[PDB]
Amino acid sequence: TTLLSASHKAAYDLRSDGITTDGRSTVLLVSVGADYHEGEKLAATIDLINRSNFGRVSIAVADTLQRHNLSGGTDIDRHARARIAGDEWIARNSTLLDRIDCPTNVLRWDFALSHPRYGDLYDAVEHAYETDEPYRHAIDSTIDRFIERRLSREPDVDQESVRKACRAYLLEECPIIMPLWAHEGFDFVIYPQRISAAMGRTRELFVVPEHPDRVAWLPLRFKKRK
Amino acid sequence: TTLLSASHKAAYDLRSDGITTDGRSTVLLVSVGADYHEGEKLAATIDLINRSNFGRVSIAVADTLQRHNLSGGTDIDRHARARIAGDEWIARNSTLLDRIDCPTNVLRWDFALSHPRYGDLYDAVEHAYETDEPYRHAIDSTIDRFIERRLSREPDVDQESVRKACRAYLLEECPIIMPLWAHEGFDFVIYPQRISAAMGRTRELFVVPEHPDRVAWLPLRFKKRK
Numbered sequence: 001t002t003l004l005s006a007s008h009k010a011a012y013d014l015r016s017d018g019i020t021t022d023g024r025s026t027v028l029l030v031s032v033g034a035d036y037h038e039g040e041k042l043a044a045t046i047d048l049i050n051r052s053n054f055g056r057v058s059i060a061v062a063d064t065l066q067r068h069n070l071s072g073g074t075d076i077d078r079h080a081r082a083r084i085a086g087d088e089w090i091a092r093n094s095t096l097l098d099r100i101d102c103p104t105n106v107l108r109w110d111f112a113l114s115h116p117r118y119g120d121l122y123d124a125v126e127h128a129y130e131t132d133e134p135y136r137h138a139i140d141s142t143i144d145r146f147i148e149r150r151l152s153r154e155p156d157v158d159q160e161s162v163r164k165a166c167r168a169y170l171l172e173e174c175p176i177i178m179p180l181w182a183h184e185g186f187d188f189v190i191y192p193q194r195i196s197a198a199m200g201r202t203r204e205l206f207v208v209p210e211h212p213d214r215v216a217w218l219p220l221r222f223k224k225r226k
Numbered sequence: 227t228t229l230l231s232a233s234h235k236a237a238y239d240l241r242s243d244g245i246t247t248d249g250r251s252t253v254l255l256v257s258v259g260a261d262y263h264e265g266e267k268l269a270a271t272i273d274l275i276n277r278s279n280f281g282r283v284s285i286a287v288a289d290t291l292q293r294h295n296l297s298g299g300t301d302i303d304r305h306a307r308a309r310i311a312g313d314e315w316i317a318r319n320s321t322l323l324d325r326i327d328c329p330t331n332v333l334r335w336d337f338a339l340s341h342p343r344y345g346d347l348y349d350a351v352e353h354a355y356e357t358d359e360p361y362r363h364a365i366d367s368t369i370d371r372f373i374e375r376r377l378s379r380e381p382d383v384d385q386e387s388v389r390k391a392c393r394a395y396l397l398e399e400c401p402i403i404m405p406l407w408a409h410e411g412f413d414f415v416i417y418p419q420r421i422s423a424a425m426g427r428t429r430e431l432f433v434v435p436e437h438p439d440r441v442a443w444l445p446l447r448f449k450k451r452k
Binding site for chain 2: 025055056102103104105106107108110111113114115116117185
């Protein structure tokens with residue numbers, strides 16, 4: 001009963017009765033640069049993981065994916081800078097991740113992108129963005145939320161630079177998190193934010209049909225202790 | 227270029243004409259404790275890997291599998307020892323694995339044993355050992371070779387204890403290396419020693435009928451440079 005964060009408690013933002021975590025496969029999605037996947041907030045997340053008694057945990061270091069958010073230089077400098085981010089994130093939080101009782105693995109974003117299925121899965125998703133009206137509306141709207149988020153701070157920013165980047169981000173994220181990890185035998189995805197509209201529809205078209213039991217989204221709710 | 231080991235050159239011990247490595251997914255199987263997975267020998271293998279221009283490389287640290295060769299205490303105590311060895315291997319040969327240029331991932335034996343398919347594949351292999359005479363022969367004779375090697379040094383050894391252990395090891399190994407990694411989408415497996423008698427039969431039984439294109443074994447040939 002030795003805790004990793006005495007000051008915080010992480011919990012699943014769901015109806016707990018419908019969650020049986022014991023011995024299941026789960027991914028811990030890490031969008032590098034988020035406060036959520038850092039320090040005392042991340043320490044409580046691991047307390048919850050160990051409490052969950054999973055069978056195996058994949059630590060998805062979504063590093064290079066963040067290159068679409070970075071500004072300046074060539075896409076090479078943006079990519080390699082976003083790589084370093086992850087390089088640093090693993091170094092910073094390694095000792096905390098070692099404290100996951102069940103077997104773990106660190107998946108770097110470039111290793112996901114290089115999976116043999118990634119090819120066809122991207123095209124499947126892109127085609128779905130063209131054909132499926134719900135997905136099209138779900139993606140176009142999530143991009144419009146991200147554009148208005150960056151324009152509140154910086155109104156001088158190039159519109160199509162933000163649109164192209166958010167389209168790129170989402171369209172690259174989706175084939176991995178839903179259909180790939182579904183195929184890779186995962187039962188859940190632990191992320192601190194509740195599933196996006198675009199992610200939801202990806203699950204609906206690519207996961208739900210044949211594997212509605214796989215890669216089920218588990219959002220997080222944090223609270224301080226005493 | 228800038229060689230990692232100037233003293234040694236590593237090579238695939240094959241008819242190199244038939245091999246197209248460019249863009250393929252491969253495993254670099256590491257039986258922790260072997261000299262081929264250390265120093266100039268390992269450094270030279272990374273050299274070859276970078277010449278080979280792979281799509282992705284999974285560095286399979288077969289650490290806890292080695293628990294079978296250890297003696298004394300409970301399987302739990304011996305597992306722990308074997309795990310620490312891996313912990314250490316990873317620690318000394320990390321800087322060197324960092325020098326593979328394509329995307330990589332470090333897979334640890336306990337995570338492989340944790341794969342959902344492991345269960346069923348173990349059972350398939352055990353069944354194969356019960357029914358397929360070529361396979362039974364391949365395993366039984368592999369163990370018989372190992373008992374001979376042990377007695378030649380330790381004549382007062384419990385032969386049935388070695389026999390039990392050896393059978394355990396071979397059976398634990400096969401479902402991962404051949405059928406699991408075939409499903410996982412690996413075009414090749416890199417090991418310093420040519421394919422086992424038992425390993426071959428596994429590939430013939432679980433890989434060759436549907437995916438002969440998958441998990442092709444690339445053995446290594448070492449040479450001191452001048």
